[PDB]
């Protein structure tokens, strides 16, 4: 079986320059009798299944824009993307069809170097309804930000909470290339109405210094 | 226009069967050899099985040798995979995926089918607001559900532009939850009307929320 190994796993390049992602298969793909490689460049969309970019190691999918071109023999491949634009965030797959079987390698996320941006923080109670089943979800918002990495602290009556919450991140945005997060503080309904000021907390380099939103339970 | 329609997915005990099906359309399907393709989630692509264009040769991925069965019905144009024993591990969208007439790479691929081996409950989630207090934040929390997929829109697909739907996270209770916001002027407050259209096709559960600035 055919290993095939990319490089890097993770890319971050600026708009308009050029990402290379290399690929290396275990054994030689190039087939003897026609003088072709048997390796395929794909890209990968979150909620899409792959698409094709490349076959025979250079040659480009109809439709698909020049900007991307492969190149390579036998073991050792490269996918250039040049003049990379903001809709080309994907995870890159290389795949050898030379013999079953079929082989993909473990993927390459390219994402996009764009400027800082700070979020925009949003905070919200738990529901009334939720309440009567007795359970208070409070949520944190980060909107529009980059980079990925953010700090978000919550804090009930001074205390930090820590186990109780879970966050969840967007896919960095193909028009905008940031990234929004949530983050969801969860306890009893019990342990809700015990404590009055619930606080998220947010550190990111785009903020000059934390950036808190609260609200105290019961109050408007 | 070429087609490839996944259906038979979803959630299905370990050791038990699943059969999944795959309507081709807009070319001569007998002509073209077919694959199946799977992606757990959050990782990387793995072929699964492989069919000639006849259905005389097939081949199979070790993991799925002995329990997988593909198979296919050029006069209905139809691609199937029987699959049996089915372990956590087979958990994955499983794409049905076409091989070119005479190169042999997969040129197209379907949208896949979610398949999630469990024995987890199937169970439909509560939906709460996320109530705003330029610009202003509003959302939906679709909290306790299983297994995955859910959709959720806003005003039936009217409202698109600045809408964030977060990845699902597994509680510890092993029940998915997810919240979906939009930004929107804060002018619009007291005039549009918010409403996330929440669907979760596996439990039969379907919820309209209206969404508004919560009253003092």
């Known amino acids: 079986d055919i290993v095939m190994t990319q490089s890097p796993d993770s890319l971050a390049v600026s708009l308009g320059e050029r990402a290379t992602i290399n690929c290396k298969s275990s054994?030689?793909?190039?087939?003897?009798?026609?003088?072709?490689?048997?390796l395929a460049w794909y890209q990968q969309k979150p909620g899409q299944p792959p698409k094709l970019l490349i076959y025979?190691?250079?040659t480009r999918e109809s439709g698909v824009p020049d900007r991307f071109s492969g190149s390579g023999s036998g073991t050792d491949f490269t996918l250039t993307i040049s003049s990379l634009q903001a809709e080309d965030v994907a995870v890159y797959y290389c795949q050898q069809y030379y013999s079953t079987p079929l082989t993909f390698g473990q993927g390459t996320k390219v994402e996009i170097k764009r400027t800082v941006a700070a979020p925009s923080v949003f905070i919200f109670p738990p529901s009334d309804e939720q309440l009567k089943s007795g359970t208070a979800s409070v949520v944190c918002l980060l909107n529009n930000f980059y980079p990925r990495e953010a700090k978000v602290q919550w804090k009930v009556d001074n205390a930090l909470q820590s186990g109780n919450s879970q966050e969840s991140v967007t896919e960095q945005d193909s028009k905008d290339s940031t990234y929004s997060l949530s983050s969801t503080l969860t306890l009893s309904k019990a342990d809700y109405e015990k404590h009055k000021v619930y606080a998220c907390e947010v550190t990111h380099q785009g903020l000059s210094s934390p950036v808190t939103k609260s609200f105290n339970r019961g109050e408007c | 226009e070429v087609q490839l329609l996944e259906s038979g997915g979803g959630l299905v005990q370990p050791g038990g069967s699943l059969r999944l099906s795959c309507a081709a359309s807009?070319?001569?399907?007998?002509?073209?050899?077919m694959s199946w393709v799977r992606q757990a989630p959050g990782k990387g692509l793995e072929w699964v099985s492989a069919?000639?264009?006849?259905?005389?040769?097939?081949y199979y991925a070790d993991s799925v040798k002995g329990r997988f069965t593909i198979s296919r019905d050029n006069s209905k144009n139809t691609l199937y995979l029987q699959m049996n024993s089915l372990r956590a591990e087979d958990t994955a969208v499983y794409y049905c995926?076409?091989?070119?007439?005479?190169?042999?790479?997969?040129?197209?691929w379907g949208q896949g089918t979610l398949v999630t081996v469990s024995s987890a409950s199937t169970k439909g989630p509560s939906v709460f607001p996320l109530a705003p207090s330029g610009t202003a934040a509003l959302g939906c929390l679709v909290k306790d559900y299983f297994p995955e997929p859910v959709t959720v829109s806003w005003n039936s697909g009217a409202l698109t532009s600045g809408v964030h739907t977060f990845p699902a996270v597994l509680q510890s209770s092993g029940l998915y939850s997810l919240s979906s916001v939009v930004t929107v002027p804060s002018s619009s407050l007291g005039t549009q009307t918010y409403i996330c259209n929440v669907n979760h096709k596996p439990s039969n559960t379907k919820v309209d929320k209206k969404v508004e600035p919560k009253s003092c």
């Open positions: 069919i000639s264009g006849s259905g005389g040769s097939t």
């Open positions: 995926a076409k091989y070119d007439g005479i190169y042999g790479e997969l040129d197209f």
């Open positions: 807009g070319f001569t399907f007998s002509s073209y050899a």
């Open positions: 025979w190691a250079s």
């Open positions: 054994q030689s793909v190039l087939y003897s009798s026609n003088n072709k490689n048997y």
